[PDB]
């Protein structure tokens, strides 16, 4: 996260760290959506152009974390993966269209002060909140700058951007399964996700029921926090039928 701030304790209790076993390193963020299921970006697990193809045994999921590098004894929980499910129409060839995957945990994780699931939006939530200017929140342990690494989870609040402005900012083809967020040059304020943040949540707090909903997944971007560029996010609601299908079946 570039130009964000340190999270408060328990500020993002759905935050999950995707952790590579060997070598030991941060792969991506992710989010807890029940005691058994974790949501992340497909590209965190599968990206053939760069020979990325992680299997269940390659990684661990770390939940309840605040510190990036510490083993947070008596606080974080480490879970193994039973199965990965990548969207069958995930487009890694071109533009990361449908950049979404689910991970089933081998065992249910116990909820605590530091571990608690986020809500997924329904149609009405999404219609009400997914509006240009409306702000959401992005969290992660990724790079502090495009060109280093945080001590603790970082947080930034960013406004959703009008679709034509998103389109006009890039040569990449933008689909309905994506939205973009970030401040405009004329807006003065800064902030963005960066390397290491992909797969993490873009959340909004409903003013109707005071619940946090995950509207996006950190997906892609060109550099980090550049003027006239915006972060791109997987549109969770648009892909929710897939999410439901997978959990209902497996």
């Amino acid at each position: 996260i570039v130009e964000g701030s340190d999270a408060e304790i328990g500020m993002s209790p759905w935050q999950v760290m995707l952790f590579r076993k060997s070598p030991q390193e941060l792969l991506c963020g992710a989010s807890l959506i029940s005691d058994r299921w974790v949501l992340t970006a497909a590209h965190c697990l599968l990206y053939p152009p760069w020979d990325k193809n992680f299997t269940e045994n390659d990684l661990l999921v770390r939940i309840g974390k605040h510190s990036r590098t510490r083993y947070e004894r008596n606080i974080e929980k480490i879970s193994m993966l039973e199965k990965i499910y990548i969207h069958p129409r995930y487009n890694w060839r071109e533009n990361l269209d449908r950049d979404i995957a689910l991970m089933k945990l081998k065992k249910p994780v116990a909820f605590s002060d530091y571990i608690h699931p986020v809500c997924l939006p329904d149609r009405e939530t999404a219609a009400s909140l997914l509006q240009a200017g409306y702000k959401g929140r992005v969290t992660g342990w990724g790079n502090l700058k495009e060109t280093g690494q945080p001590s603790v989870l970082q947080v930034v609040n960013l406004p959703i951007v009008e679709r034509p402005v998103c389109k006009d900012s890039t040569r990449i083809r933008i689909t309905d399964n994506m939205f973009c967020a970030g401040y405009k040059p004329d807006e003065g304020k800064r902030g963005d996700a960066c390397e290491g943040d992909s797969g993490g949540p873009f959340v909004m707090k409903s003013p109707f029921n005071n619940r946090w909903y995950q509207m996006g997944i950190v997906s892609w971007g060109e550099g980090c926090d550049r003027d006239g560029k915006y972060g791109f996010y997987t549109h969770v609601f648009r892909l929710k039928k897939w999410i439901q299908k997978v959990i209902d079946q497996f």
Binding site: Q24, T69, R70, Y71
Partner: peptide, 5 residues
């Protein structure tokens, strides 16, 4: 990263 048990 600190070692995990």
């Amino acid at each position: 990263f600190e070692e995990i048990p």
